Amino acid sequence: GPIRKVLLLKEDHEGLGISITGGKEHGVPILISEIHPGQPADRCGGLHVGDAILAVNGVNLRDTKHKEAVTILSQQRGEIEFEVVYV
Amino acid sequence: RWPTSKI
């Protein structure tokens, strides 16, 4: 599908509200496997199970290992821009 | 298989 830019708004007491799988060491992108109901990713409306997370806040995640992506993603605060694609 | 993290 088309590459999309998606904005997510998160408070500091919350996580992103997604489960991710995959990563470079497995030869696949960082993939959203769950959107947890009522949490920030669900509320933002534009992120979905099956989306590959290509970048967050301009940080490329295409070639990132799983735990690298966890560190990068969990570091982001407030208004967070995602670049995603559903294949 | 691949790991999953909740974030």
Author numbering:
A (entry chain A): 284 to 370
B (entry chain C): 4 to 10
Copy text from the publication:
In previous work, we have investigated the binding preferences of a PDZ domain that is known to interact with the C-terminus of the cystic fibrosis transmembrane conductance regulator (CFTR). The CFTR-associated ligand (CAL) controls the apical membrane half-life of CFTR and is a validated therapeutic target for the disease cystic fibrosis. We have previously described a peptide array-based approach that enabled us to design a selective inhibitor for the CAL PDZ (CALP) domain. The result was iCAL36, a decameric peptide with sequence ANSRWPTSII.
Thus, our initial set of ligands enables us to test the feasibility of affinity modification by preparing and screening a larger library of chemically-modified peptides. At the P−1 position, we coupled trifluoroacetic acid, 4-fluorobenzoic acid, or 4-bromobenzoic acid to the side-chain terminal amino group, as illustrated in Figure 5A. All three peptides reveal modestly enhanced binding affinity. To explore the stereochemistry of these interactions, we also solved the complex structures of CALP bound to each of these three peptides. The modified lysine and the terminal moieties are oriented similarly in the complexes with and with the additional P−1 substituted peptides. Furthermore, the distal functional groups overlap with the surface on CALP contacted by the acetyl group of the P−3 lysine in. Thus, S−1 and S−3 can intersect and could potentially be bridged using a cyclic peptide, a strategy previously employed in targeting PSD-95. In addition, the substituents increase the contact surface area of the modified P−1 lysine residue by 69, 32, and 40 Å2, respectively. A limited set of four organic acid modifications of the iCAL36 P−1 side chain revealed modest enhancements of affinity.
